[PDB]
Design a protein around this ligand. Structure first.
Ligand SMILES: [Ca+2]
Ligand SMILES: [Mg+2]
Ligand code: NA
Ligand code: NA
Ligand SMILES: [Zn+2]
Length: 350
């Protein structure tokens, strides 16, 4: 037909190489494509809460950068979908390549020694994103960006498939949920693109989700923001399982800290050794000592090993109580008590 377009354009002309099938400045004069802008919050707020928990918990820098990169992508999308200029378009698109390169560094370095750097992979990813950036700006074709972004997502999918198959079967539910909702999101990306018809919104009830649920590029921000959040969880869990201590480690820590308390000269050592000992005690209590590796977790010898740990833990908790009450000399005196309870109930099984 020959009628008035539904794009009620405002606040400057669209200087971007692409415009989505959401009516320009249709809800408000402030932003072009409203749901494509407000639907980016679950990619700005959740990854910002992850980056701050990751710093508080003292995690490896690369997992903090991963969460921050996803927030940078979120803000760039919110800005591209608000203005629709080329400057804010690249702030959505280019970070996607870089954040995906951070993800490939983490996924491929997950079984490496702590405090090591792979300068080979690092300069390779830096070169790939520099080459991709240079050609992307020169020849301004957005399908080149989409194929380059999509090839990093591809290697990241194969590396995550190797891990869930050969190394950590447990992460299957998370790894495949991350992938399922990302490919559902990518189906919705192609629906808003190919099925370009503002019929359902124009027909009935636009204010409730009757009209709003047919914004399939808004759904893509939800699903890919949620799928990219789940991929960082997956990545960080692969590193947590790898770096995790076993019975031999927890038995050593528990006893090292028992000697720190005995020989301690100040309140801060005593409280730290009691806290570290309590964590190692709860962890050791779950394991089966090597003398009992042939028995059931419910055997009388196993229930007794666990019983001694229960007694030991309550005692560590009593000594921590003394520490927090300022009874330093007394909390320190628990070391002899704690040695006696590992001798009487635990050490026979080790
Ligand atoms: Ca549009
Ligand atoms: Mg490290
Ligand atoms: Na337009
Ligand atoms: Na070991
Ligand atoms: Zn978008």
């Amino acid at each position: 037909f020959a009628p008035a377009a539904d794009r009620e354009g405002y606040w400057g002309p669209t200087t971007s190489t692409l415009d989505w099938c959401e009516e320009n400045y249709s809800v408000t004069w402030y932003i072009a494509e409203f749901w494509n802008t407000v639907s980016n919050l679950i990619m700005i707020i959740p990854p910002m809460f992850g980056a701050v928990q990751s710093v508080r918990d003292g995690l490896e820098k690369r997992y903090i950068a991963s969460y921050l990169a996803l927030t940078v992508v979120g803000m760039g999308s919110w800005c591209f979908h608000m203005t629709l200029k080329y400057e804010m378009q690249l702030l959505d698109e280019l970070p996607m390549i870089y954040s995906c390169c951070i993800f490939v560094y983490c996924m491929f370095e997950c079984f490496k020694i702590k405090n090591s750097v792979n300068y080979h992979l690092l300069f390779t990813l830096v070169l790939f994103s520099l080459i991709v950036t240079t050609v992307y700006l020169k020849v301004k074709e957005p399908i080149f960006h989409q194929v380059m972004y999509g090839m990093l997502v591809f290697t990241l999918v194969l590396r995550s498939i190797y891990i869930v198959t050969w190394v950590y079967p447990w992460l299957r539910g998370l790894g495949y949920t991350s992938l399922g909702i990302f490919l559902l999101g990518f189906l919705f990306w192609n629906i808003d693109n190919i099925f370009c018809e503002s019929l359902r919104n124009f027909r009935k009830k636009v204010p409730p989700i009757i009209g709003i649920t047919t914004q399939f590029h808004a759904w893509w921000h939800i699903l890919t923001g949620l799928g990219s959040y789940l991929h960082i969880l997956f990545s960080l869990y692969t590193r947590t399982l790898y770096l995790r201590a076993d019975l031999e480690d927890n038995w050593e820590t528990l006893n090292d800290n028992l000697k720190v308390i005995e020989k301690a000269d100040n309140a801060a050592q005593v409280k730290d050794a009691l806290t570290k000992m309590r964590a190692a005690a709860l962890d050791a209590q779950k394991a089966t000592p090597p003398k009992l590796e042939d028995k059931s977790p419910d055997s009388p010898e196993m229930k007794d090993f666990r019983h001694g740990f229960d007694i030991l833990v309550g005692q560590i908790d009593d000594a921590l109580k003394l520490a927090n009450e300022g009874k330093v000399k007394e909390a320190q005196a628990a070391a002899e008590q704690l040695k006696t309870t590992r001798n009487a109930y635990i050490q026979k099984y080790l």
